[PDB]
RNA sequence: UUUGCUCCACACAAUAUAGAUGGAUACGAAUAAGGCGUCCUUGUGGCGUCGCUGAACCAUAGCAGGCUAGCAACGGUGCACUUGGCGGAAAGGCCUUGGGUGCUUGCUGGCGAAUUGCAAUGUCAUUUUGCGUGGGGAUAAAUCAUUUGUAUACGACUUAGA
RNA sequence: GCAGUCAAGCGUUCAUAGCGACAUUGCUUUUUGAUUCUUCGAUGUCGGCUCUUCCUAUCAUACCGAAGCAGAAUUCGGUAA
RNA sequence: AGAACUGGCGAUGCGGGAUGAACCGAACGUAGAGUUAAGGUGCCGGAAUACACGCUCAUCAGACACCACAAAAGGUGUUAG
């Protein structure tokens, strides 16, 4: 595409994530947002365990401007892609102020969505046993909220129903109008070089 | 492809059971040997160079193979991907001053339909 | 040592039914209807032969094989729950202060609420097995017979009281009561 | 922020101390002045 | 500024800039599972259906139906402007109608040159700084410096007596 | 200074409830001792007073596990700063 | 703290080791092109999210020379013998 839209869906963090800021660094400005669930690897309780560190871990503590500790499930992915390309690096500063991961699941885009293969699993990478967690659910426990998305995608789903009904329809009479002309001795030969 | 380790170009691929689809199943194409297609039909059945992991090539070797991928697949070897690859190939084509008949070949298959799509 | 064909034989029993598909798993008869949803994540329960409904865990080794048998059991004493009877029976024994095994209660009942363990005060109410139905008595003892259908639930009720009923200062053992478990408890059939 | 004058009521605490007896507290009371709902409209709807 | 004036539709000159100069083309969920179709009460059944964006449409010989034109045949296609309706946590989206622009076909005619029509090659969009013909408000407002203290080191803060 | 292994011993009956000789593995850097790297071609001592802030090898408080735990009263241990 | 060969740092840049006299490669006139050392190739960042057979699942790890640390003891965790 040239503006490119990756569901988070599924997509295990870091994975996710040097995708991201390589196809960023080199410039395809993405807009990849549905956050909300973008599984890291391990269990809660580990990955819990590190976040309750990690900011949390922060501290400065002359007086609290350092390691400013953030919490989003969105604003994760960027502490990822954030560190992976020179964030001040003025190159960077700009490669960067390109990506867009929005915290779940549409709005403006709402249109598009494009899954990133191999950074891909609990589905096509990790194995096939043990230990994910949601994204934003490690935020769930580190504190959001909240679950206002996770219910108005309840909703986003409610009307993508309309549509892809529509598109099974559409389509369903398309074919079931263009079926005749396939058949068609002038088609036959948009076959033999579309098809021998 | 035999499994892996074996022969020719209308020959040499034994195979089956394990994961969930299998049974003694042979050579397709090739990449020479760098992408196959193993598959018996087998009697209804995929293939690929997934693969190697244990067993291998059921019963005999060439010959009594070369007897029979063929006495009895090939032939069938011609569902979809079968037909549906073939295609993917003369995607490779005079397309060129073969465009324009690709093109204005499809371009009058589009009103043709188009409009049905309509009266009706 | 990641054996390719490890399988186990789940026994469906006439007037039973297992909805076992998608991931999950819900069996019907006798009694009526319970569902599982297994992501153990392997198995590939399956398939038809009648009876019959084998489990089977395909190249793999460690919990993949533990697993298998864990699943088989797992349904098979869901398979259980409505073929048969539930059905635990807790006990409860008293000590120079004596119980009170009523139920009551709010919104929807919780209780049973048990009062003064060891002669203690307090109000001690817990919810009751949205699923199990909690019979206290007969004839007789003592012992808040309580059981349902899901084998797992009657138990954590059972216990769940079990455990309402403390005891924290007294190294146990004499002073050394609590409305303790008894039979379980396919009930009710036998033959 | 009106102002602050005592009170002093019977301190039907009745659960010790001074049940039942005199008691004398110290209130401070604000102007209240029953205020009418100028302009009015509303607000809401959030992901805040 | 003497209301000098500022905010909408066709122009006119300077600006600059994260780097289109064929399309950003929408189901949800599984993955030890799915997707379509399909005849059913439902999580069913039953063929069928498919491993690969090397897609799909949509193309202007990257100015074909590229400029100027002429038809038969299609009522399909799509462009711009308008109204009847409808749906959007705003924007955008779907629709109804007529007017109007271009097209599927051997259709037919004429156009393309100089070495500045395989290189520059149309063009990119969006910045407001101002300079132009119809359209709307209306002069709104904030300061400055004078009052107990709810406020104050200075700032800052809180407000009236006609 | 602080934990740890082996178990001969105590613990009247029993090695480990509670402790453990001998022998052996270690952690600790608020002792002390070595060492001389940095600072006499600027570093001012001890103690207090004040005032945050961190550690846990937890004295108290929270919940639990063992006891040679009947109650109480103690001890040992875990989560815990 | 002290000896003994051989290199070396002091007198030295250059590429590796993030980081740094003595580590590794490698010795400097000024330039073009080509291969390479050591080191590295998800991403910062040039280089494969290459290709193989296994092993490992609450902090399991990812340290050629270094303040770079970690023993004795023990596990029905799992792996071969």
């Keep these: 595409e040239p503006v490119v839209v990756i569901d988070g869906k599924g997509h295990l963090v870091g994975r996710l994530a040097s995708v991201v800021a390589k196809q960023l660094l080199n410039g395809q400005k993405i807009v990849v947002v549905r956050a909300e669930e973008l599984n890291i690897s391990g269990e809660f309780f580990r990955n819990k365990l590190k976040y309750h560190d990690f900011l949390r871990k922060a501290t400065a503590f002359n007086k609290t401007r350092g390691p400013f500790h953030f919490r989003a499930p969105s604003r994760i992915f960027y502490k990822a892609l954030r560190g992976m390309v020179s964030h001040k690096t003025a190159r960077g500063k700009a490669a960067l102020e390109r990506l867009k991961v929005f915290e779940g699941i549409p709005p403006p885009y709402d249109k598009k969505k494009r899954v990133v293969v191999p950074q891909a699993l609990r589905v096509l990478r990790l194995k096939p046993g043990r230990k994910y967690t949601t994204l934003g659910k490690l935020s769930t426990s580190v504190g959001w909220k909240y679950e206002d998305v996770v219910a108005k995608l309840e909703a986003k789903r409610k009307v993508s129903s309309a549509e892809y009904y529509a598109k099974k329809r559409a389509f369903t009479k398309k074919v079931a109008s263009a079926n005749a002309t396939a058949a068609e001795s002038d088609v036959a030969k948009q076959l033999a070089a579309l098809g021998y | 492809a035999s499994n892996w380790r074996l022969v020719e170009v209308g020959r040499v691929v034994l195979i089956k059971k394990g994961q969930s689809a299998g049974k003694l199943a042979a050579i397709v194409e090739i990449i020479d040997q760098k992408k196959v297609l193993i598959d018996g039909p087998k009697a209804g059945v995929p293939r690929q160079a997934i693969n190697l992991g244990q067993v291998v090539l059921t019963p005999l070797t060439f010959a009594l193979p070369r007897g029979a991928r063929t006495a009895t697949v090939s032939k069938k070897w011609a569902a979809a991907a079968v037909c549906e690859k073939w295609a993917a190939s003369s995607w490779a084509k005079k397309i060129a001053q073969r465009e324009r008949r690709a093109a204005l070949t499809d371009f009058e298959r589009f009103q043709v339909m188009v409009l049905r799509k309509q009266k009706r | ?191 | ?48």
């Design chain 4, 1 to 48: 922020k009106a102002g602050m004058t005592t009170i002093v009521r019977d301190l039907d605490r009745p659960g010790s101390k001074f049940h039942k007896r005199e008691v004398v507290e110290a209130v401070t009371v604000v102007d209240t002045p029953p205020v009418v709902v100028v302009g009015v409209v509303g607000y809401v709807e959030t992901p805040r």
């Design chain 3, 1 to 191: 040592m990641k054996y390719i064909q490890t399988e186990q034989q789940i026994e469906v029993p006439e007037g039973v039914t297992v909805s076992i598909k998608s991931r999950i798993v819900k069996v019907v008869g006798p009694r009526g209807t319970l569902t599982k949803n297994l992501k153990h994540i392997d198995v590939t329960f399956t398939k038809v032969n009648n009876q019959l409904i084998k489990v089977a865990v395909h190249n793999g080794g460690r919990k993949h094989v533990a697993a298998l048998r864990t699943v088989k059991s797992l349904v098979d004493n869901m398979i259980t729950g409505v073929t048969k009877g539930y059905k635990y029976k807790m006990r409860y024994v008293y000590a120079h202060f004596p119980i009170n095994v009523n139920i009551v209660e709010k919104d929807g009942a919780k209780f049973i609420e048990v009062r003064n363990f060891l002669g203690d005060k307090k109000i001690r109410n817990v919810p009751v097995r949205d699923g199990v139905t909690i019979e206290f008595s007969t004839n007789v003892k003592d012992e808040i017979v309580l059981s349902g259908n899901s084998v797992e639930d009657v138990s954590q009720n059972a216990a769940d009281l079990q455990q309402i009923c403390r005891v924290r200062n007294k190294d146990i053992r004499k002073f050394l009561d609590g409305i303790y478990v008894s039979h379980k408890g396919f009930i009710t059939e036998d033959l």
